[PDB]
Symmetry: C5
Subunit: 218 residues, 5 copies
Amino acid sequence: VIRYTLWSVFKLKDTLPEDRAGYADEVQELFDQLAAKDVTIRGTYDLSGLRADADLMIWWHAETADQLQEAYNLFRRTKLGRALEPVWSNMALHRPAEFNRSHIPAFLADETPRNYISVYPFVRSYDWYLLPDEDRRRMLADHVKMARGYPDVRANTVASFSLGDYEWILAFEADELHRIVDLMRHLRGSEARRHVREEIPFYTGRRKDIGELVAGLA
Amino acid sequence: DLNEVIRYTLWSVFKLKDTLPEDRAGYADEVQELFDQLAAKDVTIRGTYDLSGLRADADLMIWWHAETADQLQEAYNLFRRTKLGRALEPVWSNMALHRPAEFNRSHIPAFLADETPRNYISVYPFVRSYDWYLLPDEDRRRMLADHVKMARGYPDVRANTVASFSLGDYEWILAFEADELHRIVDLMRHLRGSEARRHVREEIPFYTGRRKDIGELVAGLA
Amino acid sequence: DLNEVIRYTLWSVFKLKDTLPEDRAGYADEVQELFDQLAAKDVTIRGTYDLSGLRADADLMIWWHAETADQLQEAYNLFRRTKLGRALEPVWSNMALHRPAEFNRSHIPAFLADETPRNYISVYPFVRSYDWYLLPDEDRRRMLADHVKMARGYPDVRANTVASFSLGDYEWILAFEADELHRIVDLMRHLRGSEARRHVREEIPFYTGRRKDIGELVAGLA
Amino acid sequence: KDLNEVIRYTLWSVFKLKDTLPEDRAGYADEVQELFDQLAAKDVTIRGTYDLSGLRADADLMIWWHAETADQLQEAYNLFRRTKLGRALEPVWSNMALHRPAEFNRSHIPAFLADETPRNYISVYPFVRSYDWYLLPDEDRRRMLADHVKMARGYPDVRANTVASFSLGDYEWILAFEADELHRIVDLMRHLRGSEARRHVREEIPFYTGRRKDIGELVAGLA
Amino acid sequence: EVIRYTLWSVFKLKDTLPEDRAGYADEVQELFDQLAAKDVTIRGTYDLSGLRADADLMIWWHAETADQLQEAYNLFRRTKLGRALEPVWSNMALHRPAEFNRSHIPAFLADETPRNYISVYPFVRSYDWYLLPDEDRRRMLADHVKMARGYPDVRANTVASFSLGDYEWILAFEADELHRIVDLMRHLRGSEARRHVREEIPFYTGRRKDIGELVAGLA
Ligand code: NA
């Protein structure tokens, strides 16, 4: 029913120490104690190279915003956290859909998280929500029909009104990176594209467990 | 009346330079002593709010109000001299002032009414379209009326709407309070169906967080 | 009297690097000493203003004017060498030049009419729409005249409208002065009803604060 | 036919000096050349290293590299950041793109994929089209893009690399133009302002324009 | 048919210069002399301080190739003065023949003398400006030149910069009286070409100074 989800992006302050021995195990220990507290770490992602101002993303969710705030601060006390600068951190809340109330975010359907993710915020035009419900229904229905040829890339569209600067946070997961690219380009032919004001920054990266992630960062 | 009282309100947003020390003993105590010293029947502290996690560039917000802007400036600088203030970077600090409404003159912001602050807050500046204030009065009145109607189902969400022309970059500062955070998001989504949404130029940044006494706030920050 | 006389105006905004030392002994004295020397060269400091709290990224403004831009540049650099100057970071510094008005050539900025500085200021730059200067002269005259008409309910708010084309990013710098801050807010709100509001492109950042002696200003900063 | 059917990711990574390189920088270029040699032994291609200094204030060096997976380029990026030169630099702008078949002319293959040799000057910039461009009748897009390559015909010495980047970053395409005469890029871009497709543009900044150099000469000439 | 690249490089102080700065201007002047022996011309150094919070110094230099100006820029950044500065904005342009009035070239290529004051800014036209019928553009540019004929003492430098940076043109106006640049710019707001502008910021305006005087005047 009520599930908050948070995507927290970090950049390296400079590089990690040449010997970073306890770094990944301290974080893994924290992740283990948070799961005990009903905070789910859906994934950590390597963003480096694909963005100059970002290296790491944590995707976590829980029943209250407050538990995600605590996890965020606990992570920052970590040795890895203390080597990182926060860049972008945005929360969303799963609410019922306007028209098709079967659409549940992948993370909420206990679906396996895929190898690649592309996360971006979203803001519609000023008049989108003022259109006749009939018009908003048709365009969203088209939106899912054209997506139907990409069932291998899983959608996570969550409301974020009033939690930050946006209206929705979107997160697409797929095991092949080029499938997110092709879907995104295909969805440019949707007529809902006439009703967009903002959809950046894009944070795109590779799911890794924390040991390998720490090892591959500069 | 209470529309002829002058009361300035300030929202001051800060970010940790890094993290607080492992040993932060007197940190929250020093700030509390400042607060009731400030409260010496003059500068009111409506709340301190934990914003961390909900945005990367902010960690705490102070909401204070007083009879003059000068008192709020002094309070601001005094806070920056505390140990906690010296661990923080200012991020966004905007002042506003209750001015009598154009139409419904008994909408008073909750803070000037002395109502109890709620668990969660969402504050953002607001700038209307260039011709909103040029519209026929009844057009504006109807849209604002349609807008009040669209909120009828959220009496639990308290709205502060306060004029800020020429005090900073904006026209209004808005602050919504509620005990359940999900009610603020639902109200916001619902209000997207209001006809006044066609007369908006700016409405960010959003600063949203959990009201906490300074003790637990200092303890939970990185 | 003199529209043909040349007077450059500069508003220089600074931000604390961190916090002033607790012993800030000769900080204000060095700056006052500098200001008295500048006055000897007919570089006049109209005011120093406390911006802190009303803005997170600014703490102090200096308003100075002189017969040449060169003299104001020299004063700025001299200020930056004082102890107080080395504790600040420049934020926004913008020059303007009095140029005779288009129609109401009897419009003189308050700083050129020997009006004494008021206790509060609100300073912002201004950029008109692209076609404003392309409208028939009479449509521009009417809008400028009506805007003058709406502003006569606020004779206690003194205007300083000065051209800045090609000295920086803007077309005008504006500075309003009043002994009561809430009257600047109300004027700005009232002028939103002016038809010229359909011909605006940019009017931020706003820098608003309290005029203060440099000694009291140095004392009250963090 | 298996030209656009392969998968080749390409990355342009831009860095700024933190301040200045040391006067004694004896091993700096050598370490990087070593890494580039090692990476070539991994099928990561360094198409070029470019000196961007002076042409903008916020950038000094660009690396253009491509490989079969995004992952390989991520690894290379981080390896470069560990070198002595990499540690004297600040990341500025790093964007990835992936060759996909063009909508109308599948005979448009980016120069680096047609394995043309790198020219002396490069101009790199991202691109975002208007909201309605992808909604237009397929005829209009066909016509305006045909209009576009026809006007580009007077500049065959300027080689084009237009690569899709949807959901890899903030943009829709990354473009890179290469020529041995910098002024020919300027004249091409000016001439292309007369194209009907210019009515369907939302973003095309930052431009990173610079001179291709061997890493030894690059390092010796940086401040 | 000549190729001349022109670069405007803007810097700001990291903090202030040392109270004792005896070798700073000398060293830079030596570099300028060494560059003159490679036909890299320094048209001027300009004091921007005070008119801009985030800029203190501009160098205007031009050479036959972009590469020479890169070398010069990096050489400057190695001087003691260069080490006390942060790069802010550095943009190159290239003189290309005009679409209509081929009789107009920038002042610096006509080798006339640099004036006391400069105002430099980039320029980007509307998307449809280059799409208008040639006669509409020709009329608007012609009338705009007519509006500027009352200011012969303000010298214009309009130089193409497509694909060298974020802009389409770099403009630089030189005059011995600063108020005449203000008045011309105000006057030209009544030109119909103002309907075809997308960007014209930042403005960097300052006072031409010899490097010795400029180093001594900076905070
Ligand atoms: Na990127």
